[PDB]
Design an enzyme around this catalytic site. Structure first.
Site, mmCIF file in Angstrom:
data_model
loop_
_atom_site.group_PDB
_atom_site.id
_atom_site.type_symbol
_atom_site.label_atom_id
_atom_site.label_comp_id
_atom_site.label_asym_id
_atom_site.label_seq_id
_atom_site.Cartn_x
_atom_site.Cartn_y
_atom_site.Cartn_z
ATOM 1 N N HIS A 1 31.649 31.967 19.796
ATOM 2 C CA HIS A 1 31.668 33.328 19.257
ATOM 3 C C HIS A 1 30.254 33.827 18.945
ATOM 4 C CE1 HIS A 1 34.394 36.309 17.023
ATOM 5 N NE2 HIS A 1 33.174 36.800 16.918
ATOM 6 N N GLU A 2 29.491 33.029 18.189
ATOM 7 C CA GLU A 2 28.122 33.401 17.854
ATOM 8 C C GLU A 2 27.241 33.481 19.093
ATOM 9 O OE1 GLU A 2 25.727 34.530 15.986
ATOM 10 O OE2 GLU A 2 27.458 35.261 14.849
ATOM 11 N N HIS B 1 27.929 36.736 20.862
ATOM 12 C CA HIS B 1 27.266 37.823 20.142
ATOM 13 C C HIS B 1 25.770 37.852 20.437
ATOM 14 C CE1 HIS B 1 30.742 38.863 17.478
ATOM 15 N NE2 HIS B 1 30.089 40.010 17.429
#
Lengths: 36, 48, 48, 317, 53, 50, 52, 317
Positions: free
Chosen positions: B1-2, B5
């Site tokens: 997820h990070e 991003h």
């Protein structure tokens, strides 16, 4: 552009929109030649 | 997820400044990035 | 880390539309406003 | 909740006209009728999921039962153009068909809106008027000439040339429905746009010869069969709106009016419940010199056409 | 008292002095003000026009 | 669409007339704005006595 | 609210008239925008001067 | 503001379908195409006061220019029924015509909606699929089979029988578009109405044989030409609304679906911006024993039709 260069949510456009809406409401509520 | 991003942040020519990104901040089961918008956008006073 | 990776660069989204300060020239239009009036209403049904 | 009877709904114009009449929110029952090939048209239209009922009658034997309770009589019957054949014989066959049809209507339903489509309608509406007079049931307020095609073509050409929005444009058209007699009132076109002389000239000749342009573009395959159906459907829906009591049914029809010395003339009329209610008197004055000389040019030709029609309608049996 | 004195007196009352001055970086709101001012000039001939900057 | 034409083609002529009137007034007043020749006080207004 | 489709088309015709009026007199706003970009401050006397 | 190209707009089905497509409020450009008699159709349609422009292209040489920027491709091409002509030669002629047309649209515009109208569409949609596969441009989400006519016939017959108001009545139809394979789902008909046994039997056989009733009612004058144009226009309008971004575009089409072992099957689908978006899977669960054995009977026939279509579509040149 795909609308990429518009200036959404700034100072005077909101006041202009409110003024036009108020003028339209005033004109319509008091209709009870000029207009077709 | 990070990582996704960060990648979609740094795939752009003129995105915000990426300060850092930390996984599991202080034991919480989450993750966080820090992005600081550029000064020109603040000085503009509106959004495009 | 992506400096020597050559990613697929996105196009710039927030590049400002600007006028030349003193270049004397008739900058054009398309020739119109782009607003479309809100008129969406179906035809009246049958047996009237 | 009205009732429409199409007389000749199995020919060229008849099938798309029936297709358009079926799908209207005003028609609820519809008699298709022709001498032949009317069973298949009714079978095809009986499957569409619109509540307008479809019944059909074949031959003159059931023509007596076709015209019961009818409010609007539609007459698009008439042979299209054929090779090797002239204006006279087409006049005779179309006139004979319309005599039989209007005589059947006068025998059955004197109180139904009569729309005459068969060509030339300039010399065909007087025939219908005469055969209605011969039975004592002639109502001059309930007999129209479908001349909306000239108005539609005028709107199309004007909106194409001046680049205006097609719905807003409507161009008045007076005279008749055969070549030179169609005079578009380009000086009374709303919305207001200023025209030149060459533009008015070219628009006038294009409007007057558009039908000729189509019949040569088809290479002898017939006449206009989709725009004719469009104009006929528009006029039928306007007449049905008039039967509803709507107070602004304004159209352009070829009716027996007294604007000029001619007994029959095409102009803007206002239709009511009982048929013709008014004729717009603002169309015939205010014209320029162009429309004036065009009108006095087409007057003699329209008079000749009407005289030919009224003379052929009064020949002995 | 000339025109310029009155204009400079009116400018000193309905304008706020400000540090860290920044101008518009996107020409395109300038057209909005220009069009509104031209319309307010020609059409409504009995209303003021605030200065454009 | 259900929308037929709106306010007029006549009040558009009225606002065009107003626009043209103000445009011609501005154009005229931008050329002949300053013609000053003299301002002499009439301290001898003769119609009062003579 | 059967009174939402009426104001929209009225504003549409207003926008169309404004576009048609601005298109012919586009040189006025073009030179005037050049002037505003040239000199930062601007008044109504400059309006009436630059209407040419 | 989309562009529609009708390939074969000068036959029986084509002219009323083109006329109905012209009157749509979303069409802005219409590209008529046929091997012959397309100039007259364009001349007929160029006079209607509708802002949808009309251009025509004649011959396969100008077919390459017909498919520029086209969003929806309509293929009603295919000769109607002729005396003395059997099933195999008809299938050969229609399949060759649709094969050339699908080759053309694959060469020119491979991102356009493809609607197949030629009969039988059960063995014609696989032909288009195989030809699109041969060029590497096949999109299974942008290729449909028009079977809307069965739905319209089912709605009409059910509203006529049960005396329901025809506007709300919709009957799901599964299978294909040829005879016995059309199975109406009368147990899932809205509004909710209870049916008997013999009523369901006679309604099902009437829905399955309404096509042959139409073709024998015309006494060999062709096939359905107004109801087929109606269904094709309805499907074209639905597809054009799907391109507009509406999120409730549900239709009944014969598309490539994996709900059964059969590669192609007619069922209720949901169309989006990029073509097929969803397939209604609940249509096949909840059936009674009648619909169960009807599906078991129609599966082999539809499989044979699809196999025949794929077998023809891969024949050597």
């Amino acid at each position: 552009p795909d609308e990429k260069n518009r200036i959404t949510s700034y100072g005077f456009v909101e006041n202009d929109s409110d003024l036009v809406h108020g003028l339209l409401e005033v004109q319509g509520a008091l209709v009870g030649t000029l207009l077709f | 997820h990070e990582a996704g991003h960060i990648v979609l942040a740094h795939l752009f020519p003129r995105f915000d400044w990426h300060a850092f990104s930390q996984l599991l901040p202080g034991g919480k089961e989450t993750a966080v990035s820090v992005f600081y918008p550029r000064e020109d956008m603040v000085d503009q006073g509106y959004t495009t | 880390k992506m400096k020597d990776l050559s990613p697929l660069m996105f196009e710039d989204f927030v590049k400002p539309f600007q006028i030349n300060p003193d270049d004397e020239e008739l900058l054009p239009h398309k020739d119109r406003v782009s607003y479309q009036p809100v008129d969406l209403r179906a035809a009246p049904l049958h047996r009237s | 909740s009205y009732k429409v009877a199409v007389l000749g709904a199995a020919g060229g114009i008849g099938q798309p006209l029936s297709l358009l009449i079926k799908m209207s929110p005003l028609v609820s029952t519809l008699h298709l009728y022709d001498i032949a090939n009317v069973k298949g048209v009714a079978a095809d239209l009986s499957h569409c999921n619109t509540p307008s009922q479809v019944r059909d009658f074949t031959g003159p034997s059931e023509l007596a039962d076709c015209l019961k309770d009818v409010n609007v009589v539609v007459i698009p019957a008439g042979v299209p153009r054929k090779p090797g054949m002239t204006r006279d014989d087409l006049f005779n066959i179309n006139a004979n068909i319309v005599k039989t049809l209007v005589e059947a209507v006068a025998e059955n339903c004197p109180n139904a809106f009569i729309h005459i489509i068969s060509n030339p309608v300039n010399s065909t509406v007087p025939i219908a008027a005469e055969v209605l007079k011969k039975k004592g049931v002639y109502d001059p307020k309930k007999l129209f000439g479908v001349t909306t095609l000239d108005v539609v073509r005028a709107n199309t050409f004007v909106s194409q040339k001046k680049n205006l929005k097609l719905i807003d444009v409507d161009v008045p058209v007076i005279g008749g429905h055969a070549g030179i007699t169609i005079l578009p009132l380009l000086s009374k076109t709303k919305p207001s746009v200023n025209f030149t002389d060459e533009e008015i000239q070219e628009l006038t000749v294009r409007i007057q010869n558009a039908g000729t342009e189509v019949v040569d573009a088809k290479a002898g395959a017939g006449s206009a069969t989709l725009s004719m159906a469009y104009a006929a459907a528009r006029f039928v829906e306007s007449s049905l709106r008039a039967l509803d009591g709507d107070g602004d049914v304004y159209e352009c029809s070829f009716v027996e009016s007294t604007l000029t010395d001619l007994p029959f003339f095409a102009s803007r009329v206002k239709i009511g419940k009982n048929g013709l209610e008014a004729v717009i008197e603002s169309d015939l004055q205010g014209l320029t010199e162009y429309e004036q000389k065009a009108l006095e040019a087409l007057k003699v030709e329209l008079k000749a056409s009407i005289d030919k029609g009224v003379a052929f309608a009064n020949k002995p049996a | 008292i000339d025109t310029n004195t009155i204009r400079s007196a009116l400018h000193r009352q309905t304008w706020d002095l400000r540090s860290q001055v920044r101008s518009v970086q996107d020409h395109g709101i300038l057209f909005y003000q220009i069009g509104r001012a031209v319309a307010q000039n020609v059409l409504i001939s009995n209303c003021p026009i605030d200065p454009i900057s | 669409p259900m929308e037929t034409q709106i306010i007029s083609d006549d009040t558009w002529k009225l606002v065009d007339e107003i626009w043209d009137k103000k445009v011609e007034e501005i154009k005229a007043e931008a050329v002949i704005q300053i013609e000053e020749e003299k301002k002499k006080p009439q301290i001898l207004m003769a119609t009062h006595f003579f | 609210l059967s009174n939402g489709f009426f104001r929209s088309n009225t504003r549409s015709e207003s926008y169309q008239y404004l576009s048609n009026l601005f298109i012919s007199n586009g040189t006025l706003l073009d030179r005037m925008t050049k002037t505003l970009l040239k000199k930062r401050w601007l008044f109504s006397d400059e309006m009436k001067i630059g209407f040419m």
